[PDB]
Amino acid sequence: GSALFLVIFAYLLGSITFGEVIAKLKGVDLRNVGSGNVGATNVTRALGKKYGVLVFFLDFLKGFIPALIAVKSFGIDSWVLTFTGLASVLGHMYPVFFGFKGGKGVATALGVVFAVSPSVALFSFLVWLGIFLWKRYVSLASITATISAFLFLFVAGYPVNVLFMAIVIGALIIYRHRENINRLLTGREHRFGTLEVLFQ
Ligand SMILES: CCCCCCCC/C=C/CCCCCC(=O)OC[C@H](O)CO
Ligand SMILES: CCCCCCCC/C=C\CCCCCC(=O)OC[C@H](O)CO
Ligand SMILES: CCCCCCCC/C=C\CCCCCC(=O)OC[C@H](O)CO
Ligand SMILES: CCCCCCCC/C=C\CCCCCC(=O)OC[C@H](O)CO
Ligand SMILES: CCCCCCCC/C=C\CCCCCC(=O)OC[C@H](O)CO
Ligand SMILES: CCCCCCCC/C=C\CCCCCC(=O)OC[C@H](O)CO
């Protein structure tokens, strides 16, 4: 019973459109700018990195808080954790709040992973940072770091319930990047260059 309530809590906390609450206070509706989605990436597009970092933290806490309750109440080997983390990420991407669409969900997914293993989350972040500084594609770093988190969980000996959670979350994030992949492979993906470092 408490397990079903935690999975529902994870879906509803993960549903919260923090990006939209913060964008509206700055006069912006995120459905009418950039990707049309609510998340740290589209908040960064509309409002810049100061607001982006705040929404990244908040979206991270959407994955972090239910998964930490599941780890502490049920355990790393509980399928309760599996469905709590999946609920947070599907609630972010496809919220109960009809008429909104979540962003690709890297921040929310990272919060889930950090609740399971802070070491895995930091190493996944370091992989992201390495690829980003090398190639200057955001999408390439995110896709590669998402697979890396799965590999680190596998090599570290996390059980099948955790690897199942990681593979499905990973698969959903790669699916949300499908056009980035098509652009990367056809030389159409925008790189993070001097004007992107500087003007905004
Ligand atoms: C490009 C090729 C480079 C070669 C790649 C080899 C990778 C092999 C992994 C070794 C694991 C060593 C121990 C990993 C860290 C570890 O055990 O955890 C730390 C703490 O938990 C947090 O700092
Ligand atoms: C800039 C935005 C990004 C935000 C990123 C940093 C967020 C740090 C939050 C909480 C730390 C509390 C420590 C939690 C410890 C934790 O996860 O413990 C699980 C067990 O280790 C699993 O068994
Ligand atoms: C344990 C490890 C913790 C990890 C700490 C990570 C902190 C990330 C900081 C900012 C995110 C800003 C929001 C993302 C912006 C973004 O992806 O922008 C691409 C767009 O293409 C822009 O046009
Ligand atoms: C299976 C779950 C694993 C999931 C763990 C993810 C890896 C963590 C890496 C970096 C965090 C900072 C990322 C900052 C850039 C960012 O938010 O990028 C958005 C999209 O890639 C834009 O297209
Ligand atoms: C990124 C490559 C994708 C391919 C991975 C290759 C290496 C790791 C293999 C398996 C982990 C399995 C974790 C998922 C377990 C799975 O499918 O769950 C069935 C249930 O356990 C039935 O009860
Ligand atoms: C740790 C992560 C493990 C990952 C496990 C497997 C991941 C692959 C699954 C889905 C990708 C979806 C791709 C859908 C293909 C598709 O619809 O193609 C459209 C074009 O690429 C342009 O729209």
Curated annotation (Swiss-Prot):
Known role: Catalyzes the transfer of an acyl group from acyl-phosphate (acyl-PO(4)) to glycerol-3-phosphate (G3P) to form lysophosphatidic acid (LPA). This enzyme utilizes acyl-phosphate as fatty acyl donor, but not acyl-CoA or acyl-ACP.
Q: What is its main location?
A: membrane
Q: Which segment of the chain is annotated as a signal peptide? A: none
| Leading EC class | transferase
What protein family is recorded? Belongs to the PlsY family.
Record lineage? Bacteria, Pseudomonadati, Aquificota, Aquificia, Aquificales
Transmembrane stretches in the record are 3-23, 51-71, 80-100, 112-132, 149-169
- Which superkingdom heads the taxonomic lineage of this protein's source? Bacteria
What is the protein's name according to its record? Glycerol-3-phosphate acyltransferase
Organism this protein belongs to:
Aquifex aeolicus (strain VF5)
| PANTHER family from the UniProt entry | GLYCEROL-3-PHOSPHATE ACYLTRANSFERASE-RELATED, INNER MEMBRANE PROTEIN YGIH
